Design a binder for these strands. Structure first.
Lengths: 85, 61, 22, 48, 50, 48, 141
RNA sequence: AGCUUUGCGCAGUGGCAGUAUCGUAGCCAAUGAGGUCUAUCCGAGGCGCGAUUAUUGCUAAU
RNA sequence: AAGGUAAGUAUCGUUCCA
């Protein structure tokens, strides 16, 4: 029968998996199979990131950041739906 | 203007090999190597890189 | 004339500590 | 220099940085220190 | 003169006793004094009237 | 002549006798304030 | 003194100046038996490992190598010369002589100070660097 | 049928700290690591070394 | 007598010397 590895190696293995995924993603992006990650922006970061470009057309910029928020939330919700039993 | 690039093949073989089971036993390591025909070790090739070489070799077959 | 500091030993004949400080 | 005061500096830079106030002092009294009456001797002009 | 030829080969290489956190400290950040001192110094220099 | 610090610090003798006198003045100026029912002020004690 | 690498003939010191590009060559010309030279050939010992990244120290006995006495004025008992990419880096001290440190000092921090200053001024591409400390006196009092 | 507990995963939102995170084919360790209160009690990691912009990446200017 | 050389890049002249 199997054995139950302890919480220390639980955290260690989780860290290995996440670092593995991050490095693989970064190597793929350096290759260019996906575009470089666009900076995740919120309402609080709206004028920090895009403010200079957000002065000219503020409503377009807030629409774009809210679209990014909606895309993230939709990715989460449909990820749960795909993982739904 | 041609592709002339197999580097994507290098990334895909790396990502497949990273998900390839390798025994944590040097004995098994060397047993599998003798099964395929690779040497037990190279000059100054310790155990960690022995296992890594085993992984890199069974990435093909 | 020189910038060297002269010892005021022997220069205290007509001065007091509390004078010119009221 | 006040920003440099907190940055990670090797002691070589810090030794030559604490004397910045000694240069503005020399400039502020240059018409007196750089004089012929004091510092008797020959004179040399700057190249430019 | 009466030390064996192997005993000179058996001399131990001495090493440092202190640990990494005392042999090779990470650079010590030198931050300014909290500005509450600048306020307190002038606060102490104000008197009452009665 | 550059003024020397020697002439700008009161002697201890004068300071002690003046301390006695000034504290006597303050005591006389405070016990009266008890009877007159008011707190002291900078105006009274500026001379001291 | 005896621990630092030694150069025996004229070709070796020129090669040691030439065989390096990314550090500073600090050569202690003099006689390792001199009381003056032995005073600072232990300071150069105590910092040889510390400055390994940007400095290499060679020792030269002028009697063993009588080829640079006339050209570099090797007549003070002890001399220190800094070279960068086959270029003598002049250094401005408090003393009148601005090509060498012809006296043996005592503090292991000041010599690393001078070596690092020389390296910093040599990466820029200068020929004369300025020392942090002033040696127009001895700060004794 | 729901309700609900706990651990482990995947993501999401938000807060907080960058004098700290991380490695351990180095060593020792519940057959006891480590002990200042309280010790016929306490009782889990510790040490040494290495990486370091006191975790690490891109994008962005100069 | 000092502690007072900015370090350089150029053509030109000269001279010893190989």
């Amino acid at each position: 029968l199997g054995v139950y590895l302890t919480k220390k190696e639980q955290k260690k293995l989780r860290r290995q998996t996440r670092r593995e995924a991050q490095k693989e993603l970064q190597e793929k992006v350096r290759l260019g199979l996906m575009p470089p990650p666009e900076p995740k922006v919120r309402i609080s970061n709206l004028m920090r990131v895009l403010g200079t470009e957000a002065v000219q057309d503020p409503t377009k910029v807030e629409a774009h950041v809210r679209a990014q928020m909606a895309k993230r939330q939709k990715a989460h919700e449909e990820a749960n739906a795909a993982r739904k039993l | 203007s041609e592709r002339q690039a197999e580097v994507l093949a290098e990334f895909e073989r790396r990502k497949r090999a990273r998900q390839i089971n390798v025994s944590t036993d040097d004995s098994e390591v060397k047993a599998c190597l003798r099964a395929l025909g690779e040497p037990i070790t190279l000059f100054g090739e310790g155990p960690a890189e022995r296992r890594e070489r085993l992984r890199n070799i069974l990435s093909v077959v | 004339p020189t910038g060297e500091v002269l010892s005021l030993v022997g220069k205290l004949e007509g001065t007091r500590m509390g004078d010119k400080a009221q | 220099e006040e920003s440099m005061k907190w940055k990670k500096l090797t002691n070589a830079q810090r030794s030559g940085l604490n004397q910045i106030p000694n240069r503005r002092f020399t400039l502020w009294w240059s018409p007196t220190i750089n004089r012929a009456n004091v510092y008797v001797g020959f004179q040399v002009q700057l190249d430019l | 003169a009466e030390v064996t030829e192997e005993e000179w080969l058996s001399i131990p290489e001495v090493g440092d006793a202190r640990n990494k956190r005392q042999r090779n400290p990470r650079y010590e950040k030198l931050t300014p004094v909290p500005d509450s001192f600048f306020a307190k110094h002038l606060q102490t220099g104000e008197n009452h009237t009665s | 002549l550059i003024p020397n610090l020697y002439r700008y610090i009161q002697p201890w003798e004068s300071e002690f006798i003046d301390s006695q006198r000034v504290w006597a003045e303050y005591a006389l100026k405070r016990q009266e304030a008890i009877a007159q029912n008011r707190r002291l002020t900078l105006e009274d004690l500026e001379d001291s | 003194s005896y621990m630092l690498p030694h150069l025996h003939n004229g070709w070796q010191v020129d090669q040691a100046i030439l065989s390096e590009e990314d550090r500073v060559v600090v050569i202690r010309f003099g006689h390792d038996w001199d009381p003056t030279c032995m005073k600072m050939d232990e300071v150069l010992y105590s910092i040889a490992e510390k400055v390994k990244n940007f400095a290499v120290i060679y020792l030269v006995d002028i009697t063993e190598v009588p080829d640079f006495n006339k050209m570099y004025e090797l007549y003070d008992p002890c001399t220190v010369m800094f070279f960068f990419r086959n270029k003598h880096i002049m250094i401005d001290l408090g003393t009148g002589n601005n090509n060498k440190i012809n006296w043996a000092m005592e503090d292991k921090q000041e010599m690393v100070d001078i070596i690092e200053t020389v390296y910093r001024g040599a990466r820029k591409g200068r020929g004369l660097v300025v020392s942090p400390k002033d040696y127009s006196t001895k700060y004794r009092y």
